Amino acid sequence: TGDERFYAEHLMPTLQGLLDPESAHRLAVRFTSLGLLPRARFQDSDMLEVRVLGHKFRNPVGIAAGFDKHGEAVDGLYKMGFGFVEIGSVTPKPQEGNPRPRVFRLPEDQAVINRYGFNSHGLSVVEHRLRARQQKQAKLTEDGLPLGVNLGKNKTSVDAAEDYAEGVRVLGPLADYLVVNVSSPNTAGLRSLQGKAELRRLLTKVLQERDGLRRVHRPAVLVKIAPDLTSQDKEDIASVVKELGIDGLIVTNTTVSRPAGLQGALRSETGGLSGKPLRDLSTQTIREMYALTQGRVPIIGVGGVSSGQDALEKIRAGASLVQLYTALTFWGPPVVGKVKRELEALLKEQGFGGVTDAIGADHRR
Ligand SMILES: Cc1nc(Cl)sc1C(=O)Nc1cccc(Oc2ccc(NC(=O)/C(C#N)=C(\O)C3CC3)cc2)c1
Ligand SMILES: Cc1cc2nc3c(=O)[nH]c(=O)nc-3n(C[C@H](O)[C@H](O)[C@H](O)COP(=O)(O)O)c2cc1C
Ligand SMILES: O=C(O)c1cc(=O)[nH]c(=O)[nH]1
Secondary structure (H helix, E strand, C coil), rough: HHHHHHHHHHHHHHHHHCCCHHHHHHHHHHHHCCCCCCCCCCCCCCCHCECEEECCEEEEEEEECCCCCCCCHHHHHHHHHCCCEEEEEEECCCCCCCCCCEEEEEHCCCCCCCCCCCCCCCCHHHHHHHCCHHHHHHHHHHCCEEEEEEEEECCCCCHHHHHHHHHHHHHHHHEEEEEECCCCCCCCCCHHHHHHHHHHHHHHHHHHHHCCCCCHCCEEEEECCEEEEEHHHHHHHHHHHCCCCEEEEECCCCCCCCCCCCCCCCCCCCCEEEEEEHHHHHHHHHHHHHCCCCCCCCCCEECEEEEEEHHHHHHHCCCCCECCCCHHHHHHHHHHHHHHHHHHHHHHCEEEEECCHCCHHCCCC
16 A cells, blocks of 8 residues: 555654654654544454453454553544554553653664653543543443553552552553553563562452452453563463463563664663564564463563564464554554554465464464
8 A cells, every 4th residue: 555655655754854752752642642643444354353351352453552651542542443452551650750862763673762661640640531431432342442551660669569459449440451561671670570479479469459349340460571581480470370360461561682683873772672673582472471371371462563474473373462562653553454454364365264263373283
């Protein structure tokens, strides 16, 4: 399509020349919440439909956490064509995050490095914002367009588990699923909440809080992990997740590694790297987690997805759903239709009836 080329070759490179990445991000959020977005032409095929996490998803392509941190653009994102939307991370109290600049483009690598540090409007602001459209969301969810809420912790917080517990109580009733983000590279000490006995403590408390919500307001609970885990970390996570009955895994967050071959001038900036250089590390982590959980724990695959083939590789590796964030900053909105359309053509070619049949297919052949 000419739409896709025009955004990739002209529109998005123009935006890059005009604005720094954080301004571009804020402008995008503003324009999305106003509904100012091109054609919704591609009507979703039945092949793209997935049933997982106690819900129907019209299509398996979601927007990853971080684009809509404060829940301002949910409806614009469904209009863009995403089959589900995740907001956050949201922290209990408002906070500024790190000083600017904090986000950096690596156009040669199709990569971004960010160190936002959980800038959040806080639970209360986000709660009221989601309450204003709650019934609208209940009809979207019923129509196969679910909402996820990603939870983080405040910087100065003494008690990590309590920050997540507050998030469960406040935003849990408003979410189809919740994400315990234990994998941000940009809050000190946060990533070691991924070691055994302390991860069992934390998730036990989270699941207890969740179980104490009323039935129609009781969301699925997922854990979001980094691509930088040791084999030991991964084995411990799989074990805790099976023992406790966690509903699923999001795989993966951004990486603190800098793979050999990055060209961008800004490659040595502190922060998490996303986009194309993260793609295969993330696919390999999906593959490992799926095998370690015996295919019993639904996985949302994320990291460098920018085409139907990328999405299909994650699905075949064991993802039931996928997300993207960085691709959108290089291709703009038409990237959503592109990934859906290529994913559907590839499923026909490899002889799958729908997305469901492809899930984990690499582990059976
Ligand atoms: C206004 C309008 N009028 C017509 Cl007629 S079509 C159209 C349009 O293209 N709308 C539109 C609206 C919202 C986002 C968008 O595309 C995006 C999506 C994401 C980003 N984000 C970034 O560029 C970006 C960067 N760099 C980031 O998000 C940084 C933080 C990672 C920018 C534009 C495009
Ligand atoms: C600017 C930016 C902000 C992000 N913020 C968050 C966040 O708040 N919480 C979270 O769990 N992930 C966050 N992520 C990670 C994305 O959700 C996704 O896991 C990661 O970027 C890999 O996907 P991608 O390569 O498609 O961008 C962020 C990523 C970027 C680029
Ligand atoms: O806010 C951030 O810095 C952030 C959080 C997160 O989970 N992942 C990421 O790349 N950045």
